Amino acid sequence: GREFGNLTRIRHVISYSLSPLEQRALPHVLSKGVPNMLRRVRESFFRVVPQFVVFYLLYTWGTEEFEKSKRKNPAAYENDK
């Protein structure tokens, strides 16, 4: 079936490659890779983060409320006698 002899039909594309032993494995990290990671974080920040911030607010609120609910109310004894 699917085999490297007849996958698709292409015309007029040229490629060039070096061998691994001719070139470096980690050529430019701090001059190219770091800024690229930075933009890659920039492009997705506001699509992911705010939902989790909202989750954090909800969690803390619900915890606080549950913990208030367990403390004794002075009006339950002071009001009528």
Partner: protein, 378 residues
Amino acid sequence: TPMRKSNPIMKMINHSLIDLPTPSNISMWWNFGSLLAFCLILQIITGLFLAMHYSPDTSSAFSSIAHITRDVNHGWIIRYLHANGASMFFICLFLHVGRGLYYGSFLLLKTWNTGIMLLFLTMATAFMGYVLPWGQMSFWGATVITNLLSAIPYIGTDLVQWIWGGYSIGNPTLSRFFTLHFILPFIITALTMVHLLFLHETGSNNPCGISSDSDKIPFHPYYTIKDILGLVLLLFILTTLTLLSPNLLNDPDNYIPADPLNTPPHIKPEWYFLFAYAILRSVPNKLGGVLALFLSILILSIIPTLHNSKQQSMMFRPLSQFLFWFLITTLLTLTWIGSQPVSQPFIFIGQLASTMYFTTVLILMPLTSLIENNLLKW
């Protein structure tokens, strides 16, 4: 010809993982299937060893595990490995599902359906292993899960009593749990092979959602070394969990043996289940609760049917992405609610989270897809 292609067994291996054409551009999210397989293998091996020391009898189960962890040479670490491997197995499983939801790989219908089957099987297996120690949590977990079939209106109670083998949970039920837990993993193995057979007829989808037949590379050497790297990382994490912090996920209430006369005040299943538990807790009706429990997973089967977009992947679809991450946070919320007592704030929050889960899958995503289509003018 080379021997690589001289023979059916060898040629199937070759078409599987030597000369298979893979996309050049797939990312780390595609490593989690091989890690799943690794985890299955680890579980089977460590289980076959444990099996030779465990006792499927309610008067010695607990103490057989004590024997394993105290007297068997390095038995403690074998126990630790089994228990932590299950956790890793589910971590990988959840991430594996989520990928496919994000990148639109559910359009490979056969692979997707066999995946749903596998999810169900793995969950059954994990639960039937969780009751074997016969601690205080194990017992009541068994009880609840076997009472679930009482909700079937005409035949339910009889089904419960036919699974118990008696008037109540007891010795005849533990051997059933153990036989089933022994046999299921191998059915899982066979179905995994069918799963991959179905996959290799089309090949892998990729992050861009467009056809990659102009830039296919062979599986070997590229993805061989890539998956080996992934495995090394998984082993580092697993070892640190096994030796440096073994009690991180552990539950004290399962170090008390079973007492049929007392349920403990605070109930909590294993973490990979909490969310279902929350869903089950959220409906004030028995039958409706069980129905919701099962639909929560069965709903994946109609996602392919509700797909309206012209494009396959969410990579180029921002509104979609926003909704995706909101759904993930709803699931986190259900997990958190599952850990808390059944008290009023958490009751109300859980009900909202459940309604929003189904709402989002069934309504909001389809409609955002239509809006998106209109914005691109088709």
